[PDB]
Design a protein around this motif. Structure first.
Motif, PDB file in Angstrom:
ATOM      1  N   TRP A  90     -10.648  -2.732  -7.182  1.00  0.00           N
ATOM      2  CA  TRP A  90     -10.919  -2.654  -5.584  1.00  0.00           C
ATOM      3  C   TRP A  90     -11.741  -3.745  -5.312  1.00  0.00           C
ATOM      4  CZ3 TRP A  90      -6.144  -1.996  -2.090  1.00  0.00           C
ATOM      5  CH2 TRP A  90      -4.571  -1.721  -3.293  1.00  0.00           C
ATOM      6  N   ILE A  97       0.925  -1.381   0.220  1.00  0.00           N
ATOM      7  CA  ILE A  97      -0.287  -0.226   0.236  1.00  0.00           C
ATOM      8  C   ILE A  97       0.997   1.066   0.315  1.00  0.00           C
ATOM      9  CG2 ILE A  97      -1.308   1.920   1.277  1.00  0.00           C
ATOM     10  CD1 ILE A  97      -2.871  -0.636  -0.210  1.00  0.00           C
ATOM     11  N   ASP A 123      -4.087   3.947  -2.587  1.00  0.00           N
ATOM     12  CA  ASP A 123      -4.218   3.014  -2.812  1.00  0.00           C
ATOM     13  C   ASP A 123      -4.929   2.018  -1.817  1.00  0.00           C
ATOM     14  OD1 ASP A 123      -2.711   2.394  -4.946  1.00  0.00           O
ATOM     15  OD2 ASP A 123      -1.059   1.307  -4.065  1.00  0.00           O
ATOM     16  N   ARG A 177      -6.871  -6.031  -2.906  1.00  0.00           N
ATOM     17  CA  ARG A 177      -6.210  -5.567  -4.763  1.00  0.00           C
ATOM     18  C   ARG A 177      -6.712  -6.773  -5.603  1.00  0.00           C
ATOM     19  NH1 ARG A 177      -1.961  -1.438  -5.696  1.00  0.00           N
ATOM     20  NH2 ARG A 177      -0.970  -1.792  -3.313  1.00  0.00           N
TER      21      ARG A 177
END
Lengths: 212, 443, 49, 50, 126, 222, 143
Positions: B236, B31, B37, B102
């Motif tokens: 995501w 991250i 993110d 992710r």
């Protein structure tokens, strides 16, 4: 898991004999079988891959046949260096599973065993372990049955049987039934008899002796 | 209790392999909040050019998460065989505050397939599958990874074109390789692309059928389906638990090209989820068509304060984790991404303890037991000084109807030390319990 | 225990924050005084020395 | 919050006060530094005979 | 409590096991009977950061006297922050940047300390 | 051609870890897969796992997972197998087998194999000497024109031993039988020699028992 | 009831209703009796450290799994071991029963939240956004 059984566990065949070995497959192996030769005492020999094709460096006397679940390695003529254990291994799914194995012998001489008996020695008596050995010499048919009658008592659990490999001269071996006792159970018994039965032998014979 | 469909009729479950060594790779994708993110957007607000601090559930800056990867199964020439999976099903993780995933970060690139390193295939996106629940145990064999009561299960279907969520009771099955049966390695799920994934005819129950192979789902409270467009774009996903149920977040619909997560579903689950695990999924194809699948990274959500920069579009493209390092403290304190040069004092270190030193008989309670307990106006006390004691041993002999500790806790009053103990006792009916209080007008 | 320790720790937090704000305020005042004194010292150096 | 995690969690609801305190005190120190630099500059420019 | 223990010259009535300074911190008596253990409050290490905005580099100046016990990423010191951090002798404690070059420095600059000015492009102590 | 050179036989406490090394000479060691196969007596060939050195990833059998470790050394071209928590069932001969395919661990043909490494469990088994407790002949031990006088052998704790006859001169009728394990787990074998009775008096027979681990060279009359 | 069976949120507008159906709404089916939990505790393996477990706000009781829907008798005790994953020890839940009344007395707890975006829940029922300049407005949840 794919469990594979060799239909013959041992076949006897002289030189110049056509030989077929059959391997049974639990599930469809489309074309994934390996024929391996094992002479006891060295890395084995990769003979056939895909159950049909010849590994390089192998005599054409070996031939691979089969598909699906029927598989038969074929030897056109047996040779003095053709006698070895044969293993069928599947290359189809995950872990290699090896066949049971096949033993090869010859009809070179069908001989009855020559039966001997040897009691423990006086120094093996001071030792405290007494051991009578019944020796069957130069007997070919692999099957033989040996038992011990000590004073008409059937002994079991304390005698072990040893055998050699092919003498290459008579296709027979030396079998030793080594029966072991202690003084508390040896000096109280007189008769020590070995009952040997062999198909090559005419009738089951006995080496009987009396202690002392 | 919704009808999900017919059970699975096949006696035995497909065999599965666990070569955890094949999946052990190092592909760090930590991250970093400098490009936002794994950020969940405020639920009911949006903003403009402004930059503000905001406290919510976030993944900590620089976190590596856990990487998971899916693979093809054993295939001979044209025939598929045993599935290939890792130890994800056996491993049990904890849903402390939910997690962010992710998806398809490595797609659009070519990498060696994990299952066959010599083979190389263009990385392609795949979707994770999760089992979440409140109670965990082992199977009959002692294999970890059994969810007892109603457990939420999320799995992708139709080659990544829909998502199904359902809250069922899973009971194992007694066939060969099925988790209640014999010769059980690990449950999994699969879809065969030759038949299930035909062009324009994506079987939308294929993965559900695979799942039903191993479990007999029962007492299903609900089932939900969400459609998914096919593409090869990083995305995501997020899961969290509130008193309102469980919330599902994704970047797919609102910020497809930016990655901000927005809620798209709330599910009626109200028992606190404590555990989760990733369902292993093997793709039942032929070795000549072994494709590579992008790894998915799971990062846990922690209460945290984040400085968030909002664009005119309102999309977050930049953030600061205020608790990462000292410079982050400065940014968060001045509430800006620019701080003037200078020498700023920050929070100081402090040493760690070790080796708690102690120095220091038999406080008796016999008169409590012998005789008649006197009246509540003739109550009698026991002072204690120059002795040590245990209160649980005394209290286990009786049946305490009321235990209320003021300015002290019920655990501490059994464990703390002090100068002197005063224990007064008398005969007291339970009828006048209300009169027995510090704040009461009773006689 | 937990439920009441939240209230107690809140009391301490508020008290300490208030004292610390008072500290900051008096520091600001005293700093301004020192700045004016520094200007006076500049004048004394230029005028007397 | 002398080092205790629970207290810091609670203080999270107030953290802007700590930020204000820190910033104000930092600015005061900067102003002190400027004052000292200014006064010393006036002392400077004096050609000292050794 | 948390605090270093030492042995000190005898003072006080000695009947009690605790000596106080009129504050919560205490000298704290004998750890074992027939001995003396004067006690201290646990020490802490101050930390400061120089932004150096034009360069964008960061230098971790430590406390005025923190140049022996402190070590880079030390296991002993657990900061309230995620412990992610951000050496020249002891001018004023240890500093993460390590340049002893002084040469000649002009008045303008961070002026972190008495002597040092930390000119832009690290290069501390001038 | 490839040479798969194994290591010496191993005798170790049950529950201990056994390390077996196989070295490959010739061919390309990194690309080729080397697999470990164990033959337990009377149980048949069993596949334990395989590894490809260039990839460095090790395939494992389901039962041995979490116990067996397979590693390879790129510089010395040597493949190693480690088995923890040794058991009586574990005692077996282990073979390193090269796979003909350049890669593809899943499809395996073992073109080349190692000679084999024997593994035995030992319950605190101490290296000691053997003893000559032979078999002298007698009249009742003489059936016909020849009898059999032997050397036997008893109670040495390492597996290798060597019985020779009349300092190696006696080779006629010499039959040696494999050493067996008793409930006391000792080492006991026999070696009987068929000698004519006429040679009992004119020739005195002594068998030399040689134990290299105990370095015992013992001659006691038969 | 609050520390082991059902607790609401101190930080949300709540309305708590104790109501009853006299005789009309017969569709509601009477239970065996009233049940509640008077103690849901835990012991560690030391046999001398006991931990009561208060229920969290707006959540289920931790001992709900080892307690049936209706407690069989007052003072009933239910025990269960905990896995080594979850620390082991011992989970002990105490039930309590209450004799039933003639008509069902029911309890409602309503928590609205002035929180999320989503849509809006409101009472059902040209002065609109088109005349924007004119002051005064009421949105989905903002007034």
């Amino acid at each position: 898991d794919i469990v594979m059984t060799q239909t013959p566990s041992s076949l006897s065949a002289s030189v110049g004999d056509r030989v077929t070995i059959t391997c049974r497959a639990s599930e469809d192996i489309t074309s994934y079988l390996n024929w391996y030769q094992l002479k006891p005492g060295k890395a084995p020999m990769f003979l056939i891959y895909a159950a049909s094709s010849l590994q390089s460096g192998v005599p054409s006397r070996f031939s691979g046949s089969g598909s699906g679940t029927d598989f038969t390695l074929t030897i056109s003529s047996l040779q003095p260096e053709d006698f070895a254990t044969y293993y069928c291994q599947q290359s189809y799914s995950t872990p290699p599973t090896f066949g049971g194995g096949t033993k090869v012998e010859i009809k070179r001489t069908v001989a009855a065993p020559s039966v001997f008996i040897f009691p423990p020695s006086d120094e093996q008596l001071k030792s405290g372990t007494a051991s009578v050995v019944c020796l069957l010499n130069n007997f070919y048919p692999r099957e033989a049955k040996v038992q011990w009658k000590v004073d008409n008592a059937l002994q079991s659990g304390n005698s072990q049987e040893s055998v050699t490999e092919q003498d290459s001269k008579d296709s027979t071996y030396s079998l030793s039934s080594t029966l072991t006792l202690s003084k508390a159970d040896y000096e109280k018994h007189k008769v020590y008899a070995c009952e040997v039965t062999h198909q090559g032998l005419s009738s089951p014979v006995t080496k009987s002796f009396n202690r002392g | 209790y919704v009808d999900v469909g017919p059970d699975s009729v096949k006696s035995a479950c497909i065999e599965v392999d666990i070569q955890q060594t094949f999946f052990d790779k190092t592909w760090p994708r930590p991250i970093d909040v400098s490009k936002a993110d794994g950020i969940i957007y405020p639920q009911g607000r949006t903003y403009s050019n402004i930059t503000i601090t905001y406290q919510g559930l976030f993944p900590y800056q620089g976190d590596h998460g856990d990487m998971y990867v899916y693979s093809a199964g054993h295939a001979t020439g044209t025939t598929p065989q045993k599935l290939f999976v890792a130890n994800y099903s056996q491993d049990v993780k904890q849903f402390a505050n939910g997690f962010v995933v992710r998806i398809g970060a490595a797609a659009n690139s070519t990498g060696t397939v994990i299952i066959s390193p010599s083979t190389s295939a263009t990385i392609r996106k795949i979707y994770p599958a999760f089992m979440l629940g409140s109670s965990v145990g082992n199977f009959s064999d002692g294999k970890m990874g059994r969810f007892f009561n109603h457990t939420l299960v999320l799995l992708p279907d139709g080659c990544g074109t829909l998502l199904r969520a359902f809250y069922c009771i899973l009971e194992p099955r007694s066939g060969n390789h099925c988790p209640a049966g014999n010769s059980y390695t690990s449950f999994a799920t699969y879809h065969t692309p030759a038949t299930d994934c035909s062009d324009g005819n994506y079987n939308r129950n294929a993965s559900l059928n695979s799942f039903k192979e191993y479990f007999n789902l029962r007492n299903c409270t609900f089932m939900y389906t969400y459609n998914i467009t096919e593409d090869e774009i990083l995305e995501w996903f997020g899961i969290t638990q509130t008193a309102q149920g469980v919330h599902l977040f994704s970047s797919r619909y609102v910020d497809l090209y930016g990655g901000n997560m927005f809620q798209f579903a709330t599910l009626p689950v109200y028992d606190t989820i404590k555990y989760y695990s990733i369902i292993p999924h093997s793709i039942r194809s032929i070795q000549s068509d072994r494709k590579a699948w992008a790894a998915f990274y799971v990062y846990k959500l922690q209460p945290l304060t984040f400085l968030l920069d909002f664009s005119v579009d309102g999309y977050i493209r930049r953030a600061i984790d205020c608790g990462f390092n000292d410079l982050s403290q400065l940014h968060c304190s001045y509430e800006s991404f620019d701080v003037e040069s200078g020498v700023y004092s920050v929070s100081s270190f402090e040493a760690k303890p070790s080796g708690s030193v102690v120095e220091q008989v038999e406080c008796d309670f016999s008169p409590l037991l012998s005789g008649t307990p006197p009246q509540v106006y003739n109550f009698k006390r026991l002072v204690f000084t120059n002795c040590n004691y245990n209160l649980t041993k005394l209290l286990s002999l009786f049946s305490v109807n009321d235990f209320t500790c003021s300015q002290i806790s019920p655990a501490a009053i059994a464990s703390n030390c002090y100068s002197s103990l005063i224990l007064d006792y008398f005969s007291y009916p339970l009828s006048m319990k209300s009169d027995l209080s510090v704040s009461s007008a009773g006689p | 225990d937990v439920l009441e320790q939240d209230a107690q720790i809140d009391r301490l937090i508020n008290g300490r924050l208030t004292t610390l704000n008072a500290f900051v305020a008096q520091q600001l005042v005293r700093s301004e005084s020192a700045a004016l004194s520094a200007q006076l010292a500049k004048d004394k150096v230029n005028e007397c020395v | 919050c002398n080092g205790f995690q629970k207290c810091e969690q609670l203080l999270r609801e107030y953290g802007q006060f700590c930020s204000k305190i820190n910033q104000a005190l930092h600015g005061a120190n900067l102003r002190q530094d400027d004052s000292v630099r200014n006064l010393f500059a006036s002392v400077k420019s004096s050609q000292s005979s050794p | 409590g948390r605090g270093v223990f030492q042995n000190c010259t005898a003072v006080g009535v000695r009947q009690q096991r605790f000596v106080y300074d009129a504050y919560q911190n205490l000298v704290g008596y004998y750890s074992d009977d027939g001995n003396y253990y004067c006690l201290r409050a646990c020490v802490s290490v101050p930390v400061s950061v120089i932004y150096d905005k034009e360069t964008k580099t960061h230098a971790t100046l430590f406390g005025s006297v923190a140049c022996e016990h402190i070590s880079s990423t030390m296991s002993q010191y657990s900061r309230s922050t995620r412990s992610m951090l951000k050496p020249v002798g002891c001018v004023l404690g240890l500093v993460n940047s390590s340049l002893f070059v002084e040469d000649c420095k002009l008045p303008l600059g961070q002026s972190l300390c008495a002597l040092p000015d930390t000119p832009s492009t690290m290069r501390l102590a001038s | 051609q490839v040479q798969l050179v194994q290591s010496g036989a191993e005798v170790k406490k049950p529950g201990s870890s056994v390390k077996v090394s196989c070295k490959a000479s010739g061919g390309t060691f990194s690309i080729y897969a080397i697999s470990w196969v164990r033959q337990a007596p009377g149980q048949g060939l069993e596949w334990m796992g395989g590894i490809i050195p260039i990839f460095g990833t090790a395939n494992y059998a389901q039962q041995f997972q979490g116990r067996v470790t397979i590693t390879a050394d790129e510089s010395t071209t040597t493949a190693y197998m480690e088995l923890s928590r040794l058991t009586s069932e574990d005692t077996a001969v282990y073979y390193c087998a090269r796979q003909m395919t350049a890669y593809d661990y899943w499809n395996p043909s073992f073109d080349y194999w190692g000679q084999g490494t024997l593994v035995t469990v030992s319950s605190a088994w101490s290296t000691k000497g053997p003893s000559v407790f032979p078999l002298a002949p007698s009249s009742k031990s003489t059936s016909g024109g020849t009898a059999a006088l032997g050397c036997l052998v008893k109670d040495y704790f390492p597996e290798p031993v060597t019985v020779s006859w009349n300092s190696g001169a006696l080779t006629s009728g010499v039959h040696t039988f494999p050493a067996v394990l008793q409930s006391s787990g000792l080492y006991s074998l026999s070696s009987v020699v068929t000698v004519p009775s006429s040679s009992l008096g004119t020739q005195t027979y002594i068998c030399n028992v040689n134990h290299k681990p105990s370095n015992t060279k013992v001659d006691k009359r038969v | 009831i609050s520390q082991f069976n059902y607790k609401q949120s101190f930080s949300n507008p709540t309305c708590l209703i104790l109501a009853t159906v006299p005789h009309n709404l017969t569709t509601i089916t009477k239970p065996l009796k009233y049940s509640y939990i008077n103690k849901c505790s835990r012991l560690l393996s030391d046999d001398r450290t006991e931990v009561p477990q208060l229920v969290n706000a707006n959540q289920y009781s931790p001992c709900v799994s080892i307690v049936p829907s209706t407690v069989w008798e007052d003072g009933d005790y239910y025990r269960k071991q905990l896995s080594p994953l979850e620390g082991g020890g011992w989970l002990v839940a105490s039930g309590s029963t209450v004799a039933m009344t003639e008509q069902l007395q029911m309890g409602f707890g309503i928590t609205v939240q002035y929180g999320t975006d989503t849509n809006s829940v409101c009472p059902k029922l040209k002065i609109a956004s088109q005349l924007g300049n004119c002051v005064e407005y009421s949105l989905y949840g903002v007034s």
